[PDB]
Amino acid sequence: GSFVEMVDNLRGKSGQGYYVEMTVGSPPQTLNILVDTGSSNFAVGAAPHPFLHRYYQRQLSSTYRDLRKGVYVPYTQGAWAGELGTDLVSIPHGPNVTVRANIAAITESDKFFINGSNWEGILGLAYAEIARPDDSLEPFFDSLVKQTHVPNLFSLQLCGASVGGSMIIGGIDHSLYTGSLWYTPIRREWYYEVIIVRVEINGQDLKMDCKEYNYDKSIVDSGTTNLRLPKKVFEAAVKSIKAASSTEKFPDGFWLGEQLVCWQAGTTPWNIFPVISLYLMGEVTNQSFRITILPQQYLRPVSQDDCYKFAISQSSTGTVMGAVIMEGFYVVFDRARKRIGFAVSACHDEFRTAAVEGPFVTLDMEDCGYN
Ligand SMILES: C[C@@H](CN)Oc1cccc(CN2CCC3(CC2)C(NC2CCCCC2)=NC(=O)N3c2cccc(F)c2)c1
């Protein structure tokens, strides 16, 4: 247990993301920061906002250096605008180091911050290629590795339903997982891009061309709540999940995330819903492994009734393995060896468990990738 002080350093609210404490500036200003492997900017709320309990006050930080350049980050669901600068940054429940990092001071935003989420900023852990304004703005993790001896790796244990978890920086904590860690290559260093080679619903192959699973990319994203699937894959997966859960019928809108279904406290029939398996490309020629998720992961909780939302949704920008997928596992972002590791999380029911299994023989896996 050498990484013991980093265990349980994450907090959150169901479907509102996981956040870590980060200390910025001099004297110290500690804020709650969203852990986001799907973006590459370190950015903090820097002006009052109704959804913010606290914000970064640059005038109070003697070490703050204004880069005198604006930054704008737009997404489909929201956006933010701010000012670029650099300041001293430490993670009190993270590595024992202090770095000078790029920081975007968010002055205006639209549908970005979440009311009651308890976080005031975002830590983009992906690579420089997708940083804004461009790839010359060094991401936080790159600054960390360049300025210190911290090994070029981090790992995440996101615990599902108030939520908690651990972000281990510079290593792997063996108390956070059971069984073996199975690695999939990082195809390209921009998002944490991976290759899905096969999909099963209750052991039944979806039988789609594997190029469709990765069209136009498949990413591992701690900042996205859902498992997001390309339209054609989503349609086939829903059709298969509906057929496997036919002991009870649900309205069409439930599968589209438009309708919620609620059950009396402790009566959710988890047993009627299928398990879902995603096969990932392994580290050896023709070898793959699979990660299996339970309905406890893909039906997320939103009194006497437990309300759930179907947390598999459609995408037009590739597959997104969000918190739905990550919650069943201990996930290792091995940047040094360009690979992502999965193991069963130390954080299910009496009949089934999330699993990481292999090896399997899968031929022509290279044909599954989009070019
Ligand atoms: C925790 C999550 C719960 N919905 O809320 C947030 C809020 C802010 C940021 C993030 C991280 N994160 C920011 C980026 C994200 C996902 C979540 C996105 N990513 C795409 C990029 C292209 C490839 C596929 C993935 N598209 C969106 O519209 N997003 C978004 C979602 C919600 C709000 C938003 F402003 C942007 C998540």
Q: Note the maximum CA span of the chain.
A: 64
Q: Please indicate whether residue 39, judged by its CB atom, sits closer than 6 Å to ligand 1.
A: yes
Domains 18-150 and 151-371 share a fold: yes
C-alpha to C-alpha distance for 367 and 214, rounded to whole angstroms: 10
User: HSE-up of 79 (CA within 13 Å, CB side)?
Assistant: 8
Experimental method: X-ray
Q: Please indicate whether residue 267, judged by its CB atom, sits closer than 6 Å to ligand 1.
A: no
Residue 176 in tokens: 């956070």
Coil/strand/helix, residue 344: strand
Of 322, 8, 320, 21, the closest CA to residue 162 belongs to: 8
CA 138 distance to own-chain centroid: 21
Q: Ligand 1 centre and the CA of 249: distance in Å?
A: 31
Integer-rounded Cα Rg, in Å, for the chain is 20
Of 126, 158, 118, 164, the closest CA to residue 8 belongs to: 164
Beta bridge partner(s), residue 54: none
Q: Which residues contact 17 (CB under 8 A, 6 or more apart)?
A: 34, 35, 36, 114, 117, 119, 222, 223, 225, 323
C-alpha to C-alpha distance for 40 and 47, rounded to whole angstroms: 22
The region that residue 112 occupies, defined by phi over 0 for left and psi between -120 and 50 for alpha, beta otherwise, is alpha
In the chain, alpha helices (H): 140-147, 231-244, 252-255, 295-298, 323-326
C-alpha to C-alpha distance for 68 and 165, rounded to whole angstroms: 36
Domain boundaries, the chain: 18-150, 151-371
Resolution, rounded to a tenth of an Å? 1.8
Q: Is 134 a catalytic residue?
A: no
In our burial notation (b when 16+ CB lie closer than 10 A, e otherwise), range 311-322 reads bbbbbeebbbbb
Q: Which atom of ligand 1 is nearest to the CA of 76?
A: 28
Q: Ligand 1 centre and the CA of 278: distance in Å?
A: 22
DSSP per-residue letters across 346-365: ----SS---EEEEEEE-S-G
Q: Which residues contact 103 (CB under 8 A, 6 or more apart)?
A: 24, 42, 43, 44, 56, 84, 85, 86, 87, 89
CA distances to 24, 49, 186, 330 from 46, in Å? 12, 9, 34, 33
C-alpha to C-alpha distance for 70 and 169, rounded to whole angstroms: 30
Of 179, 134, 116, the closest CA to residue 41 belongs to: 134
Q: What homologous superfamily does CATH list for 18-150?
A: Acid Proteases (2.40.70.10)
C-alpha to C-alpha distance for 73 and 368, rounded to whole angstroms: 31
Handedness of CA 107, 110, 115, 118 (dihedral sign): negative
In our burial notation (b when 16+ CB lie closer than 10 A, e otherwise), range 139-155 reads bbbbbbbeeeebeebbb
C-alpha to C-alpha distance for 156 and 137, rounded to whole angstroms: 24
Q: Is 221 a catalytic residue?
A: yes
Residue 189 in tokens: 């260093």
Q: What residue has token string 């002006």?
A: 47
Q: For ligand 1, atom 35, which residue shows the shortest CA distance?
A: 78
CA distance between the termini of the chain: 42
Q: What is residue 274's DSSP assignment? A: P
Instruction: Decide if 166 contacts 192 (C-beta within 8 A).
Output: no
| Strand duo 163-169 + 218-220: pairing | unpaired
Specify the fold of 151-371: Cathepsin D, subunit A; domain 1 (2.40.70)
Give the active site residue among 36, 87, 142, 334. Answer: 36
Question: Could you give the angle at the alpha carbon of 201 between the alpha carbons of 198 and 203, nearest 5°?
Answer: 80
